[PDB]
Design a protein around this ligand. Sequence first.
Ligand SMILES: [Ca+2]
Lengths: 112, 572, 38, 75
Amino acid sequence: DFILFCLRLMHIFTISKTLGPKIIIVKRMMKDVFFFLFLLAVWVVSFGVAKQAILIHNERRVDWLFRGAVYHSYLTIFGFPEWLTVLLLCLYLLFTNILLLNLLIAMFNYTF
Amino acid sequence: ENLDPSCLFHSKLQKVLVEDPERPACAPAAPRLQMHHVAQVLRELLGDFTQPLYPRPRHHVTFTMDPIRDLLIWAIVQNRRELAGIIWAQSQDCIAAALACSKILKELSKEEEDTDSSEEMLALAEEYEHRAIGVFTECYRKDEERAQKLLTRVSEAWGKTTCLQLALEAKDMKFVSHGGIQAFLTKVWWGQLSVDNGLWRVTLCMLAFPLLLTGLISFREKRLQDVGTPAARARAFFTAPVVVFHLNILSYFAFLCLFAYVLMVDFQPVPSWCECAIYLWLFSLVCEEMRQLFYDPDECGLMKKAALYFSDFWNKLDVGAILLFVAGLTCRLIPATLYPGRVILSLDFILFCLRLMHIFTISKTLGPKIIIVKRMMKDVFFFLFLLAVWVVSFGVAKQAILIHNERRVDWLFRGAVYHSYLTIFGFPEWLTVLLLCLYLLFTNILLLNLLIAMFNYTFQQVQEHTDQIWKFQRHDLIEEYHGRPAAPPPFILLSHLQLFIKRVVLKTPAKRHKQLKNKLEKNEEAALLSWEIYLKENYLQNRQFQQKQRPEQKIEDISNKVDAMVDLLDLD
Amino acid sequence: LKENYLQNRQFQQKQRPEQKIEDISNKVDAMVDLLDLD
Amino acid sequence: MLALAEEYEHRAIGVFTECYRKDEERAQKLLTRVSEAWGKTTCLQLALEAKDMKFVSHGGIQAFLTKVWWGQLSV
Ligand SMILES: [Ca+2]
């Protein structure tokens, strides 16, 4: 409820001349923000499940390996195994560093 | 017989005359022009889906049915513009006629092997699709319902095809991008129930069985809405294709969760039960796609239907995932290759989860963005080659200067590769500052502006008509889920078995449904055609009045009056 | 083909609207001179 | 003088696009030929040395460059 109260302070910027239309713009942008973030979430879950399947055997560990792989996927999302590691990192680079970012740039520029 | 010789249609007719064997059966030197030769060369132009127009005799004056059709085709095929513009105004059912002329002119303009007449033919075809749009928008603004009824009807005059199929096969963007036909597609997509309920209401009625028996959601055709026959209401609710779409999405989601669970924990060398349920569901999916291939509503080419199936993107992706799963099971059955079978099934899980991106095509705002990304990937790839050779260049240069020659296999090589990866992901004082500032100047600036420029550039073009492409794309999704049975992929075997045992012994092969195509009665069709004739006569007057109101025409009229006046004053 | 091109060029230059306005103006000036001569 | 030169490159583009729309092959043959009247130079070399963007940006001459670039085999 403190978060809800502090959200109410954004109403102050409506009275000023230059600031209000930007708030009205953000109120429109949130709609396709949400439906993008679903697409991003299912994508990162897909690569997390694929990596934890290939590079770790089947183990019934409850909170150790699960939170470890989840923290690995979180660190990836926030930003002879030589050929295999280079292939996995370059595939994650090619997908994540490029495609959905241009999707966001295109959609946000379009609605703006 | 007196068609002019220089045109393309005369050349194709003179070929198909001598390709007939029945004339060397009679006499080789004498050519006899028959009507079914013209019908054959017209069937080659119009498409395979239509039946021949002029029949062959299997044996005073005599009229064929609808002679204005024949005169319009004879004026169209040899690019006489002003004759066609005159005798189109006399035509019976003009909506189908304009689109058929547009299809004929596009197909005849493709094979021209010239330059002037090809552009003339394309301009004429575009003009005729404008005529069809004008007459249909008059019929739409007057009455909402009969204008919808005018689309799905079969037309005897043009070889038993509907108007919508001609508009699709001729690839007319501006006709199907009209508001009324899009409203028709939405009306078919929402099915039996009313179109104003919203998505969350259908979601809650899908989750809750007794909520449909209440006063919730909506209906149209209020004989079912008022009187309570909940068996019929439930059959109508589960018949609708939106419901079948959400059921397939939910079943696919549960299938993916079970596949991820068995891949993460239950990959066993002994054959497993949670695996065999998934093999059952995947056999269900492949039998569904085989049924989707074998559907032939009209008589058509099997190889042509195969090219039509494999032309589509998601069919290629679906059959690739099926083939990879077939390979993965044979890799799983051999005990020596169990872990390669595991990694193959993981890559196939990636392929299955890529299929969930298809859901966003149906929504209004989201689909054009997918069409934009499908264009952007092409120069994405050729950029990433340039980025890779660049980072390899600085990695090799740095590892050459700051490390001596050592034959270490995996230690120093993976160390330098991890250093280059950490660089890519984001008195040695002067040298280190120089190396870091050089990597800063190159990496933090140049290729980033290359990406910004190229991506902005291609977005500025594809953004313009992604919407017009998507409105044309919208049809086949609705047609497929109209054709698909209602059961989710667990029970679609129970749906498939009755159809398969029925088709073999005594049934029809395939028949279209009476929502997309139907044959009207004569008593209704006469009044409908008279209504359309009267609205065409209404449209032509507004067109000629608007063309008279143009300013350049007023200037030309004043000039002609002034020339008449100076001639009159010269005569005095 | 050059002789073919020149005719299309001069016909397109004749079809311009400002040239039509100038032609109407010259005809009207000829007419007012003729009515002044009577 | 600059306006007159731009007008004359428009004249050259118009006559060449007529020759191109009528026949595809002889229009290609018209470029590479040597001209005795203007000191034994070809037309393409004059269009390059005069720096005319709109002449070499035409579709037919670009098709000629593609045709030379693909060489003996089909394009
Ligand atoms: Ca399919």
